[PDB]
């Protein structure tokens, strides 16, 4: 393509899209933590008989 | 020829399931105790036979 002097290309990042994606990612991260806790207790009962 | 594939950066963990081992331990302990009880029964029977 063509060029243009006296100008620069931006970072093409929108905080609107990232903030909503950050919230979703955090919950997904929170959620999987339940499985470890669930798997931990489900094994604690068995070893303790 | 039926061989597998190679994945870099991975490792195959032991295929030991820690869940079933505990119930197997329970069953083994109970069976061993029952057999020991059978040994004790035989010994008691012979001892009371020979007490005459």
Curated annotation (Swiss-Prot), chain A:
It is found in: Bacterial flagellum basal body. Belongs to the flagella basal body rod proteins family. This is Flagellar hook protein FlgE. It comes from Salmonella typhimurium (strain LT2 / SGSC1412 / ATCC 700720). The gene is flgE. The chain holds residues 354 to 402 of 403 of the full protein.
Curated annotation (Swiss-Prot), chain B:
It comes from the Bacteria. It is found in: Bacterial flagellum basal body. Belongs to the flagella basal body rod proteins family. The basal body constitutes a major portion of the flagellar organelle and consists of four rings (L,P,S, and M) mounted on a central rod. The rod consists of about 26 subunits of FlgG in the distal portion, and FlgB, FlgC and FlgF are thought to build up the proximal portion of the rod with about 6 subunits each. This is Flagellar basal-body rod protein FlgG. It comes from Salmonella typhimurium (strain LT2 / SGSC1412 / ATCC 700720). The gene is flgG. The chain holds residues 209 to 260 of 260 of the full protein.
């Amino acid at each position: 393509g063509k060029l243009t002097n006296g100008a620069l290309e931006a970072s093409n990042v929108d905080l609107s899209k990232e903030l909503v994606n950050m919230i979703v990612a955090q919950r997904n991260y929170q959620s999987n933590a339940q499985t470890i806790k669930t798997q931990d207790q489900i094994l604690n009962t068995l070893v303790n008989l | 020829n039926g061989a597998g594939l190679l994945y870099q950066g991975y490792v195959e963990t032991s295929n030991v399931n820690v869940a079933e081992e505990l119930v197997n331990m329970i069953q083994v302990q109970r069976a061993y105790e029952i057999n020991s009880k059978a040994v004790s029964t035989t010994d008691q029977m012979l001892q009371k036979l020979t007490q005459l």
